[PDB]
Amino acid sequence: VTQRRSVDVSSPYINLYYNRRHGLPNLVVEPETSYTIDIMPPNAYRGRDRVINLPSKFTHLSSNKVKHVIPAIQWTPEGRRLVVATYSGEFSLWNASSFTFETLMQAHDSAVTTMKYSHDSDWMISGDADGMIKIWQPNFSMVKEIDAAHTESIRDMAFSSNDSKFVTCSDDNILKIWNFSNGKQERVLSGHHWDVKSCDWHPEMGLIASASKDNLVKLWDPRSGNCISSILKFKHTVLKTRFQPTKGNLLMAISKDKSCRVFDIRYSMKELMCVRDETDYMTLEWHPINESMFTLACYDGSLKHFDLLQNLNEPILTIPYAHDKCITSLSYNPVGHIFATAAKDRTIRFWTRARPIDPNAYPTYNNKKINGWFFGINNDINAXXXXX
Amino acid sequence: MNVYDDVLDATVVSHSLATHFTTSDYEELLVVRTNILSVYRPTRDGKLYLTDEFKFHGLITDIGLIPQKDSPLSCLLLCTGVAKISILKFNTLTNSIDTLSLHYYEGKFKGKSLVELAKISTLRMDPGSSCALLFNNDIIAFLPFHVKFTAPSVVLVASELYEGAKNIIDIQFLKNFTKPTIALLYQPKLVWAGNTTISKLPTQYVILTLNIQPAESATKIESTTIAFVKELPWDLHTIVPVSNGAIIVGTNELAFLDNTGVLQSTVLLNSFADKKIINNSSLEIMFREKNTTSIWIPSSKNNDETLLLMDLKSNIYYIQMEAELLIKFDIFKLPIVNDLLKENSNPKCITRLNATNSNKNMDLFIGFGSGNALVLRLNNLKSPFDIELLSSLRNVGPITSLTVGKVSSIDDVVKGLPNPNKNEYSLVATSGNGSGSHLTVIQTSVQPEIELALKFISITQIWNLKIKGRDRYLITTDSTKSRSDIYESDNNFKLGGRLRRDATTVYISMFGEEKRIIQVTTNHLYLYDTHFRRLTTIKFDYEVIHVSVMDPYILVTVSRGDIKIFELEEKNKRKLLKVDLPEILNEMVITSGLILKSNMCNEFLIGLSKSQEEQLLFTFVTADNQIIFFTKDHNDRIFQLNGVDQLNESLYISTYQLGDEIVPDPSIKQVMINKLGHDNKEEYLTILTFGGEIYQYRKLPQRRSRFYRNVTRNDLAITGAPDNAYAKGVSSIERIMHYFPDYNGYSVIFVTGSVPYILIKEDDSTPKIFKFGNIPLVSVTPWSERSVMCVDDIKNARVYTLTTDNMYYGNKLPLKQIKISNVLDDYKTLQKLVYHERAQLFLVSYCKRVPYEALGEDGEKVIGYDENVPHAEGFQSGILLINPKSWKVIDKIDFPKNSVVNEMRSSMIQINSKTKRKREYIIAGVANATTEDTPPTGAFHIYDVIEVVPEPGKPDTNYKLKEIFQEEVSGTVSTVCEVSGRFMISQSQKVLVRDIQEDNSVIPVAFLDIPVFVTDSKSFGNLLIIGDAMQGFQFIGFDAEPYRMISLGRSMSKFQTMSLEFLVNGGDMYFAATDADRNVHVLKYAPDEPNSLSGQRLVHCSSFTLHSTNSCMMLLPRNEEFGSPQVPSFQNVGGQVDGSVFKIVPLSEEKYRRLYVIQQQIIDRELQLGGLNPRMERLANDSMRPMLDFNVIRRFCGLAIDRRKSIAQHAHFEAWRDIINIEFSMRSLCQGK
Amino acid sequence: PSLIHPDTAKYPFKFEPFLRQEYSFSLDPDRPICEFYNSREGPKSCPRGPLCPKKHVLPIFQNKIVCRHWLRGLCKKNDQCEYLHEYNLRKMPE
Ligand SMILES: [Zn+2]
Ligand SMILES: [Zn+2]
C-alpha cells in the first residue's frame, strides 16, 4: 500500500530483451526523463556508453536501526540483497527491491570483518574479529564453521574462478588457500614479512594477489605455495587489492598511502595509473560488468569513480561528500544498477545509475539531512538540495 | 553433442557495397546478409538479379572494396566477428572467392584493450585506397596497401595516434587528401544524457593525416595532426565524410567539420541539442543509432553532391552542401508521401547502385534490419521529387518469435480432393520490427494453390498437350495395368481415337511447331496429327525407358542401352527420319538421354563460335557418369561435361575422349540444363542421382562452356544420398525431373517422388529445392498456362500453381509473408507468436511503440516532465488472435500503456490435478516496461479460446479470446512456461508456478527465487530452464503433490542469456542457451560427473558463436528419416535477429563422432571462403566436443564424389544416412497428430 | 506427432535414477504418494527405498503453516524446519 523507491532492473531488462530480441540497437538516451525507459540495465552498456551505468545518483541512505559500525559490505550475487556485516556480529540484509532490512542472521561471535560470495553464486565465506571463518548457504546456514582459520582476525576472503578453493588473509603475515568442498587448507602461502591486509583471487586464471603491510602485492599460484611475481611499486602499505571480476585482465591495489595503482596481469605486471589523492584512499570495488571502471573511496568520504579508458590521471566522477565520515566498505550488486557503500558514520548509502534529467544531479555538502526523504514515490526531484 | 544448421539462411541486410567484384562488365551490388555475401546485378528496371552467392563460415561484421592493380575487378575486404579482416579476390576462372590474405586482429586487440572488445568491430575504407583501418573500441588495426597485395598490418590504440583520443566514438577516412587521413571523433571524458549537466561540449574531433610507411616485416605509423576540434556536442556519434569535410551525425546535433578543422556550420536537429553557425530545427528528428547509415554520393560531369542519412524509424534525410568556407547547411526529411519505407525500420546499409553519370535521379539500395531491403529510386532532389519502390529484396526481419503451427492442413479437403499439405505444420516466425512487421510462415513445403482438382483411376504418368497454346488433350497411363487412356480439356476419355490405348505409353508431347504428336509406347513409337490419327510408326527390339523431345527431334533409349534419335521430315512433317548419330557412343553404355537447346558448347562448335545462340545438342548420361552431347551437325565430334564422374565444383565442357576408364557406377539418373527464375532466366545444369540427390550447376554468362556450382553456399538442401542411403525417398516413386519454362512466371524444375521437390529460382537468390507439398507426387504436367497438374500416389491429380502474391523462394526454405497489419489498423511489431491447437489458430502479441509516459505509482509525472520535446519509445502491447485459414485478425485484446507482452505461450495446463484434463490455454506474460526506479508492474493474462457464434458477414471469426484470469502482480512478468500442467511466470527476481483450478481460480503453488530477471524459460515436462538475464540460467525441477521447485543446476558459466531451450538426444539432457554475445551455450545436466558437484553445477560442454542474437529458440520434434524412433527425439529450432532460423538438432554419441570426423576433415583438407576455420570461428570465451557447423558439413555434400568417399574415417554410407537425418529433421513438420 | 507443444513428461533420462536418490524428485510430476512410508524415519520406512517410483514427502512438506523466512528465500532451517516450504495460499499467515 505504502510506496517506496524501488530500483529494479526487471523493467529495463524487458526493454533490453525486447530491443535485443528485435535487433533494435540500444537507443541513445536524450536529456528528457521519458528516455529513462531506454536506459538499459548495466551489462547492456559496454564501451563508449559505460558511463551510463556509472553510479552517481544518490538513491537511499539506510541505517540498521540500532546504529552500528559496518565493517564489510557485499551483495548477494543474484543482486537481490545486500549483506551488511555488523560489529555486533550479525548479517543485516537490505534488499535491493525496496531498501528494507530483512532479519539479522547473527553470524559470528565477534565482528564480521569481511564476507564474499562464490562465483557459482551459491555459497559465501564470512569471517571474524576472532580467528574463525564460516561457510554459508545463500539462505544463510553455517555449513562449515572453521574455528581455527587463523591465529588472528581475518581480513579479506576471495574465491577461485571454479570456487572449489578460496583464499583467507589475516593480521597474521601468512595466507591460507582453503580447499572449499572439504573445508581444509590445501596450500599455505609463505611470504610477506608483515600482515596481509587484503587479498584477491583472479576470476579466471589461477592467480592470487595479496595486499600486505610489507608494502608489496605478491601474486600467488594456487597449485603451489609460491608467488609468481612480487610487485614492489608501493611505498607505505598496500591496503586492499582486487581484480576486474569480469575479465580479470587488470589487477588493482589501493594503498594506505595517498597512492593507488592499477596493474595488468596480462602484461608483465605493468602499472597503468598511479592516482594520488590528498585525502587517503581506503577501499575499492570494480564495476562488476564494466571492465576498466571502478570506485575508490577516501577518508574524507569521497566516492571517487574512475575509468582506465577516460582519465588515468584523474577521477571521472567525484562524489566528494558522499558520506559524512571515512568510507570503510563498498560493493556493486553484480547486476550493476545499485552501488552500495558504507562508512564509519554507521550509515549505508546506495548509489544507482543517473537518470537523464534531475536538478539534484550533482548532493554537494548537505548540512543537516543528506538522507532527506528520497523514497518519495519518484526517482527525480527539483532542487536547495535536501528535502525536509 | 549437436549439429547446427541454418534451416532458414540469414536475410537481414547488414552491409552492402556497389563496386565491380564478380565482373567488370556491370556495377555489382554486393550484399552482405550476415554470413551470406550475395552479389546482385541491378538492372535498368531496378530488379536485383543474383550473379553469385557466397556463404562465409563466420559473420561478415563489416565490408569494403579495395581496388587491386593490373585487374579492373576490385578486391573485397570483409571482417569476420571480432576483428578478422579477410581480403577477397574474385577469381574469374573458378568463379569463386579466393582469400588473398587473412588478418587476425582479435589476439592483437585483446593485447591492447583493457576492456572487453565490442562484438561489432567496425571497418573503415579510405577513398585514397591506400590503408583500410579496423577499429574496435579505441583500439585500431591498420591494413595498408601497396600502390603481395597487403602490407604488414599494425595494431595501435588511439592514444598512440593522438595525445588525447581516450575512447573513440567513430573513426572515418576523409575525402580528397593526397596521403590517407583518419578523423577520430572521440570523447576524452565520456558523456551521456545524465553527464550533460557537469560536462559541456565534451566530444573531441581530430583529423590525423597518416603516414603509412610500410616495411616488408612491420610497418611504422606516424600521424600528423592536421586539425583538432575540442568543444563539440556530447551526442555526436557518427562521422560521415563529405568532399569539403566531415559531417558529424549526432543524436540531437549535426555538425559539419571541414578538412581544415574548424566547425563551419552545425544544425541542431531537435530540442535536446545546445552549444559557429547555428541552425535551429523545430522538426523533432533524432539519430538514436550508435552508428547511423548514410549514403554520400560525389559529384559528376560539377558541384552537386548529396548525403542522405537515415533514422532508425526509417526516414531519409538529405543534407545540403556548398563547397567553397561553407554556406547552405540544413537537413531535410524527404517527403515520403507514398509510404513505402513504412514497412521498413533499422536501416543498416544504404548504397547507390546505378551511377547514371548524374547526381540527380538516383537508384539506391537500402538494406534494412527490419523490413525488406528496398531498392529505391529517388527521382529529384528538392529542399517534383518522388521515391518509388524500384525493387525489393525479401527480409525476414528479426524473427522475433517462432512457433510451429498449421497454416495449411487447416482445410482437410480443398477443391474436393485431400489437401496437398495434409497433416503438415510449418514454423511461423514474426518477422519485421515496426509498422511493416509481419508473420512469416517459414514453410517446410511449398504450399501450392489449387486451380482444379480431379480424382483419377489406375494411372501413373500424365501428359497434357497444348495444341495452340490452349490445353485440349490430356493423356493418362499405367505401368502395372498396361493401358494408356486419353482425356480432354473438360476431362472426358477418348476425346479421339487411333491411340495405342491398350499399351503403356512412355512419352506423349507436342511436336513440329505444335502440329504433330509423338506417342512413344514401350515397344512402338507413334506419330499423330493435331486430330489423332496414326501417320508414322517405329518398332523397337527392346523396351523404351528414357525418352526426350524437342521441336523437331525425338530421342529414345531402349532396354539394351542403345539410343535412337529421330528427326521429323520438315518438308511435309508426315514421316520420320533416323538421325545419323556418332558411332562412338554405341560402344558406350548410356543410362539416360535428353535433347537440349542451350548455348553451352556453341563456343566449341565450328558454327556460331562466340555468338550466344541456343544450338540444339543431344545430351546423354554414360553409365560411368558423364554428360556427353553433340549437335545434329556433329561430324563425329562429340562433346562432354568434364568431371562429372567426380562431379567437382567446376564443370567445363571439352571434347570427349574414350579409353578404358569405364567404371559402371550409375549416379546420374536424370540430367537437364534449364533456364530458371521468373525474370532472370539463368541456365542451370541439374544433375539428379539414382539416390534421389539433386546437384545443380550454373552456366556462367562469361565463359558459357564452363559450368560451376557454389559448393560453399548451401542453397540446395540435400534431397537424397549417393551411396544408396535415404533409399526411402527414391524406392517408392522414381525420381524424374520435369522442367517447366513457366509455372507462375517462375521457371521451375519439379522433382517427382515420395518427397516431391520444386527447384525455384527467384531473382533474389540461387535456385533452391523446396519440398513440394506433404503429399507424394508421381508425375507432373504443365497445365494451361502458368500452372502445373500434379498426381498423387493415391491417384488424385491436382492442378497447382505456386503463390507469388506474398511468397518468397530464397532463404533455402520457402516463406510466406503474412501482413496482418492492414490499412485500417496497423499492429506495428508482432512479438511472441504462439499457435493454439485446440482452436487451430495463431495468437500474436503486437506491441505499438507508444510515446512513453514517465510516472510512478501515483498519476504525477517525474520532475523532468516536458511536452515540447519528442518523447521516448515506450510500449503498448496487446494480443491478436489470427485464424490462419483467412489470416485476418479475429480478436484484438489490447493491454494498458507501458505494458509489453515479453513472452506468451500456449500451454497444456491442468484444469483438475486428479482428472488431468489438460485444456489448452494461452498465457500472456505482460510486463509494464517502465523506468528502473519505478516499481516493476506486470500481469499474466490467461486466455481460453472459445468457439463463439460467427459474425453474419465474414466467416472464420468463430473464435474469441476469453479473459479467464488476469492478475496485475508485483514484478515484471517476463516469461511464461507450462511446467507439466502447471504454468510458471516470472516476476522481479521471483518465479511463481501457478496452478489453474476448475473454478478458474488461479493460485500460485510453487515458488523460486531466480538471479536478476528471467529472459526465457522453457519446460521439458516437470523440468525447467529459467534463464537469468546475466547470471546464466537455473535448471529447475518441479514437483507436484508437495509443490517444490527444486533447484537442480546453475549454469557454471554465467552469461547474459538470450533464449533458453532444451535439446535431449536421449540419455542425459542438454540445454541450449544463447547469449547477448551471439553465442549458443549447450550445457548438459550431468550429476553423474564428480566435477559437476551433484548436478548443481551444469557442465558447459559446448559454446557456438552465432551470426546473430537468437531472438526465439523453440523446441519441436525431429524426423528420424533413416533410423527408427524408439525415443521421441527433439531438435532445437531457434530464430535469429538477422532473420536466420537455425536448428540445433542433437545427435547420438556414435552419430556425432562420425560427423565430427567429417567436420575436422572438411575444415583441414578443403579450403573455406574467407580462409576462416569454422571450428576456430564459432568460438568465444565461454569440453573439447564442439557443436558442429552443418554449414561446413553440407560442404561434404557439395564435395566431389571421389573426394567425398575418400573422406571416410561402412562409414561413408553411415555418414550420409545421418547427414540426411539432420537436413530432414525439419520434415517432422510434415507429420500430424 | 503433436509438434506444437510436446513437452513430454514421460521422457527417459540417465539422471532419472539420480533424481530419486537426491532431491527426492522423479520425472513424473503428479505421481502418487507411496504406501508404507513415514517422514519421521526416512528411506528406512519404504521397502523400495531412495529409488522409489512414487514420491516421498519430507517432514518440511507435511508441515502445516508456511515459513516466512523461506518465502523471502532465507530460512536457516533449509531442512527439519518447524514450518512449511511450499508456497500455497491455503497454508499462509498473510
Ligand atoms: Zn516409497
Ligand atoms: Zn523454513
Author numbering:
A (entry chain D): 27 to 388, 391 to 411, 466 to 470
B (entry chain A): 1 to 147, 193 to 320, 326 to 351, 358 to 380, 383 to 441, 496 to 607, 610 to 1296, 1303 to 1329, ...
C (entry chain B): 1 to 94
What did the authors write?
The 3′-end processing machinery includes the highly conserved cleavage and polyadenylation factor (CPF in yeast, CPSF in metazoans). CPF interacts with Pol II during transcription, monitoring the nascent pre-mRNA until it recognizes specific RNA elements. It is reported to contain 15 different subunits, including the Ysh1/CPSF73 endonuclease that cleaves the pre-mRNA, the Pap1/PAP polymerase that adds the polyadenylate [poly(A)] tail, and two protein phosphatases (Ssu72/SSU72 and Glc7/PP1) that regulate transcription and 3′-end processing (1–7). Computational analysis revealed a protein–protein interaction network in which subunits are organized into three prominent modules centered around the CPF enzymatic activities: nuclease ( Ysh1), phosphatase (Ssu72, Glc7), and polymerase (Pap1). The poly(A) polymerase module contains five subunits: Cft1, Pfs2, Pap1, Fip1, and Yth1.
Cft1 forms the core of the complex and is composed of three seven-bladed β propellers followed by a C-terminal helical domain. β propeller 1 (BP1) and BP2 are each formed of contiguous sequences. The C-terminal helical domain of Cft1 is located at the nexus of the three β propellers, further stabilizing the fold. Our structure reveals an extensive interface between Cft1 and Pfs2, burying >4200 Å2 surface area. Next, two of the five Cys-Cys-Cys-His (CCCH) zinc fingers pack into the interface between Cft1 and Pfs2. The cryo-EM structure of the Cft1–Pfs2–Yth1 complex of the polymerase module has a markedly similar architecture to the eukaryotic DDB1- DDB2 and SF3b complexes.
